[PDB]
DNA sequence: GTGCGGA
DNA sequence: TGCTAAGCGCACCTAATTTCCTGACGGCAATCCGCAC
């Protein structure tokens, strides 16, 4: 009989993503031609329009406010944006880097094998390939585009392309042949029948000629300068890997109140999405209580809770007992 | 029963750890030697007997995550923290600790000793390196895995070597003053971390990662290093890092 | 004085009782240390650390905490609640000296000033002059644990950071010209959570910079030299029968495309993609022939020497008489 | 049931404007001929004519004053300035970047739907197209011009031209057919009946031969001279300066009957030109949005025009606790 | 679910 | 498809002085704390 989670248990990511690099193109010559995209320096003159106490308002309502910033825009002769990144898929059971107790290892390996037996990592993989098909990794670069085109290459086989403006960001499709064929290979990589899979993703966004591209913004703490700082990857603009992965993990539609709020949330340990300030899974349908009901008090759970637990184990983290002194 | 040299050529590592409590820069040498040992341990579970006994570290390009100000100084950047286990795990904003990350392109020269060292060993290393990390960073791509014979089959780059003589023969009154003076005289040297030193005795405590091994509390030790090109080098053996263990000291040295 | 001070740090008499009463209930919860654990993650349960008072070597090859010249020890608690002693032994008195130096000699300068403000200076001084040492007793998930090979087997090692060494690198680099980096990530409230005096005083430390030399730093120039150009014409529907240029007027099109793309991009050899035989094999497949139709040659419409991809797209098969035309024009 | 504004509220722009690039042409051959315009480096010798204290003036009144500058002029063979920029129009209900309370989102969406139910974003859009029609984005390049012509292109249709010296800068026209035709599409883009709209604007300014052109100047922060804006090697203008000249549409402030001119739309109504704040206590954005959403009161239509104009402009509107 | 305690 | 083999490319001397290098206003709001009660 096992009574508490082990003193040291850790997991690693099974979906590893690389940083993205941005380019500019032309749409009718998008398979032959590419130019670099660079970040520029912009300084502005503003007015004080923040909410101030009434004493300070009488003294500071009409005062100048210079600030420093940075910007990124396309040229006057190019109308498209090209984004290239890559994903590495690794097996789940070989991603346990630490486990102090041996019986917990045996029990969790038995539970993952029973999950391979029934729904062998196919539904979750279908949702992850969908979140590549609708292009949610474009966050503010998806607003105001005429054509969005996404191409997925596995090994040396280029798959047929996607029109990413024909998918809704609230429904998951389970009847497209290309999505099913990628999802089967990702399921086989997750289940142990393969050992590694490398995916390459290229996206083309047509926004207009001299329009604004929105790169990722860095979190830096300096006291002399306080301005907007954007990501520069090898001299050119880019997006972080964490941004692209949050977009990919937005697959959760099994939280306790989904009939009121009807959007999918990211997969987290307490359902803490950064958009809404109240957690969605705070006590009874959290990860710790469901894994203490699955393993420690042997009991069959509904399939949605198993989907959530396995998605947390694909995400990774430090899952251990409350540390005592 | 045989000895050779295998070269892992031009590997891209993204987001590797770059903080060792007094140093922000190149990762510690123990991470690279542990990458070599992890490759050895994964190859020996596929029933392929091999033993890596020395690694040479060659540098081609680097990029520290951050920016350079107008005064010429670096300002580091860190990712936004997420949920961290503890007493404030259900909150929306988490704490910000001390961290730094670096991007590297490097090449590795491995001295292998086994019963067979052909190109099937190279194929196995190619099949076993897409499931490992270097420091805490991911491998995006490599160029080619091949056997070498002499110094002229090595690509161009700059190797890292130990310079402990330039630290023991300088200034005085403490070791840190020798470090600062030796860094002020010749400008092409860097401080590096080279292993660990004990702070307690060996035993068993509660809370270990593996509860069936020996345990010791340690502190990191630091030394000096320098860069030499690959076309001004004498011998292969003068750029290979190895393990050495005294009683209370866990180090990495060039003999 | 230690007078006004113990008031600034909050009637005007119940006060001086609150500070001194709050002080004695906490002088048994402050210990001495050279290495602390919550400097890595401030969520490590307990008071785990170490006091390394050993001997220097001075000619060993390595820097440690015992070979440097740390001058001031550190005092550490577990919870900020209990942290008055570190402020108390930090208030400077009249002679520009620290409560610490006066409590080791007992100059009456203090002897006099305390006894009017309290009734228990005797008990307080004994608890700041014989302080217990920090002991390493257990490990947790927040302290970094790694393996190290020792002689056919492995040892598990838990790393504890050094607080006294961090304070002395920052002082000795504020007056120096070797490269350095300042880290500004720790806040005031989180520094107090660590529990150490030397981290709440230096929360934004100065550290060494250890980088490779500066001609090996990434930029846009050393990133456009690892990419290769492809032509803007698809031969598959373009004046050409099965790969061979039938129209002599379409030669100038090849000349102008090669002139346009890869014009001012010279690349030395080390910076050129190899010329694998598989691509001229793969080009022929599309059109058969099993063999080069002698009298014709594969020409990369964009010179693999002025920047071009070793790809099926960047070639077109033209006659030798046509080939002598193109190799001279692009050379010129 | 709603007390306070949420702790993280922000909006995004619904009128994204590109930067401007400047060219030089001739007026009779302006449909077949354009040349680049560049910024030149100037240095000037001066006299010390700034106001000084009496002691320093006796010692530094006949001293030379070297200074550095920059300038931009047309050539001897060209007489016309050509400026090109573009506008992207996005919907208003899908421009909400952050909100930490779902009920406030539902309330804001209901009030915007009520706004589309009374007036389908048509008055504001007519004012925005009016500020394109009178060429208010030419700030100092509009003084001293013979002919100003502005052409508006949407998709592959070039709308008929505008004479920008017949529109007054203090009145808004509602009877011009071309303005109405563009404004209906901008209003339908604001409503949500279309997902985006891209408008490209070209303007020709006849000023004469070798006369001066005034670009935008760059901000300096430490201890400086005159630096002018360069966009792809040529002279040009900032996007913020054009966008400020397209938001001078507010004629609903409390003291409009005394000063009869439109002001740009801001939160406290601050006119940098005429040195008076015009919306300081009760008709600011904060009090009106706290009297619209948090107490369910039916405001007059002019205040609704101001609130929707601020929500097309954008900003950070967050409360502490 | 609170309030403490420093630099 | 071939287009040369050999040698060498100065010794002197210098590179100016004066006067000065602007006055204004301002440089964001949010958050990033464990622990004992």
Residue numbers in the entry:
A (entry chain A): 11 to 335
B (entry chain E): 0 to 254
C (entry chain F): 1 to 10, 15 to 242, 244 to 337
D (entry chain B): 11 to 233, 236 to 333
Please give the exact wording used by the authors of the publication that reports this structure.
Recently, a newly identified type I-F variant, known as the Cas8-HNH system, was discovered to lack the Cas3 helicase-nuclease gene in its CRISPR loci. Instead, an HNH nuclease domain is naturally fused with one of the Cascade backbone components, Cas8, generating double-strand breaks in target DNA molecules. The RNP complex displays an overall G-shaped architecture, comprising single copies of Cas5, Cas6, and Cas8-HNH subunits, six copies of Cas7 molecules, and a crRNA molecule. To elucidate the molecular mechanisms of target DNA cleavage by the type I-F Cas8-HNH system, we reconstituted the Cascade complex and obtained multiple cryo-EM structures representing the target-free, partial R-loop, full R-loop and ssDNA-bound states.
To further reveal the DNA recognition and cleavage mechanisms by type I-F Cas8-HNH system, we reconstructed the Cascade-crRNA-target DNA complex with a 56-base-pair (bp) dsDNA target containing a GCG PAM and determined two cryo-EM structures representing the full R-loop state and the partial R-loop state at resolutions of 2.51 and 2.57 Å, respectively. In the full R-loop state, the whole 32-nt protospacer sequence on the target strand (TS) was observed to pass through a positively charged channel of the interlocked Cas7 subunits. In the protospacer sequence, every five consecutive nucleotides hybridize with the crRNA, followed by a single nucleotide kinked by a β-hairpin protruding from the Cas7 subunits, forming a periodic “5 + 1” pattern. Five periodic “5 + 1” segments are followed by another separate 2-nt sequence base-paired to the crRNA. In the target-bound state (full R-loop state, unless indicated otherwise), a 5-bp PAM-containing duplex (PAM duplex) was unambiguously traced based on the high-quality EM density. A lysine finger (Lys85) on the NTD stacks against the PAM duplex and forms a hydrogen bond with the base of -3dGNTS. Compared to the target-free state, a hook region on the NTD of Cas8-HNH protein rotates inward to stabilize the PAM duplex in the dsDNA-bound state. An Asn-wedge helix (residues 193-198) protrudes into the target DNA and unwinds the double strands after the PAM site. Specifically, in the full R-loop state, Cas7.2 rotates outward around the axis at the Cas7.1-2 interface. In the partial R-loop state, the HNH nuclease domain undergoes mostly minor movements compared to that in the target-free state, whereas the HNH nuclease moves away from the Cas6 subunit by approximately 11 Å in the full R-loop and ssDNA-bound states, thereby disrupting the HNH-Cas6 interaction interface.
